[PDB]
């Protein structure tokens, strides 16, 4: 039925919240407390989502590293009574988005899927970032696709459709994998299969997550391994 | 010095001659003898090189699968006294270029390089083909680049430069690896490093290959592993 699985990366396969929290504390040290840096990370991710949504509505693209970098400079000004950062440290902190750590089910899950399927990443992150993230998150791909190649961000149909022609595959023979329900419904409209992955800690324990019911998508799983088990991929020794 | 290694695929990492010879014989069987089909393969590659060379001067791109297919149809017209093939068999024969086998030094050599460098494919083949070849040639990349993404073939400078911006890398921080000396010289022009890999059996045992002397390129090796050793990459267990 399926020849390839297209994967969302940030959140679906990677714990960016814990990554960026421990990334900033390691750089900033005691100049900022943990409780306050966790709140900057949350607002950081929120500024990225608000900006991309705005750029999608404008049908515009720009570097996601510039999106992270600019939105951190704006938050640092808002948090400037509590702590401070140099221009060099601003770049090092932004680099944390290219050092994402994967969820413990992802590397072995990806390995299990390759026995019958091609696996490729389709992220809004810049091409350089997802290549880097592959090292820090131990993601192993047949192909790496970014919103940078298509000039537009998900859920724009040019991204999903473009990924299909580049891979030589029909959308109906691609399984889109994401922990974000809105952009999974957009894969459905272009004709792709849909697999939702529950990530209760994507936005932390205090985060409200999307309640998705059984039957809305083709698959509903808590781990890539489970998805591989449901697709008929044999487990690893 | 180098942050990424960009690799030629067809010939540099893959024994396409042996792949396509045994591929067509399995499809055409006794309808064609080996010595006569081996001569078609050689002309096939040459029609591909002539067409791409023509398209580079025109600053045109078109699907390399269509290039292989069309140049196969022309050879079949040339060989129409000796044997014949259906349109279905034409597609299966063309599929042999997406089922290439690697030289035995390539998979472990690429893996050895990944300890210190990013490795990416930069082939004139269409994006779908190199994805397939990754399975048949056992190639594992941080990134996969094709002339299809840039609208131009190697050795056009838009390809090398585009691969640099996509990876976040300066051309001077890219090491181009190829078994074809002419297109290696253009990487040098854009500012990239140059590594030549001798493939004496690329065009068969009785085939004439590019004889490259010491000093023309930055590296001159008989295997990907050898290149990794010269780049300071620790060996594999």
Author numbering:
A (entry chain B), B (entry chain A): 11 to 247
What does the paper say about this structure?
All these three CESH[L]s exhibit high sequence identity (>60%) with L-2-haloacid dehalogenases, which are members of the haloacid dehalogenase (HAD)-like superfamily. Studies have shown that both RhCESH[L] and KlCESH[L] adopt a two-step catalytic reaction mechanism by 18O-labeling studies.
Although the previously proposed catalytic triad of RhCESH[L] consists of D18, H190, and D193 (22), D193 should not be the catalytic residue in the catalytic triad because D193 does not form direct interaction with H190 in the solved RhCESH[L] structure. Comparison of these structures with the wild-type RhCESH[L] structure shows that these mutations did not lead to significant changes in the overall structure (with an r.m.sd less than 0.24 Å). However, the mutations of D193 disrupted a salt bridge with K164 and resulted in a significant conformation change of D18 which subsequently formed a new salt bridge with K164.
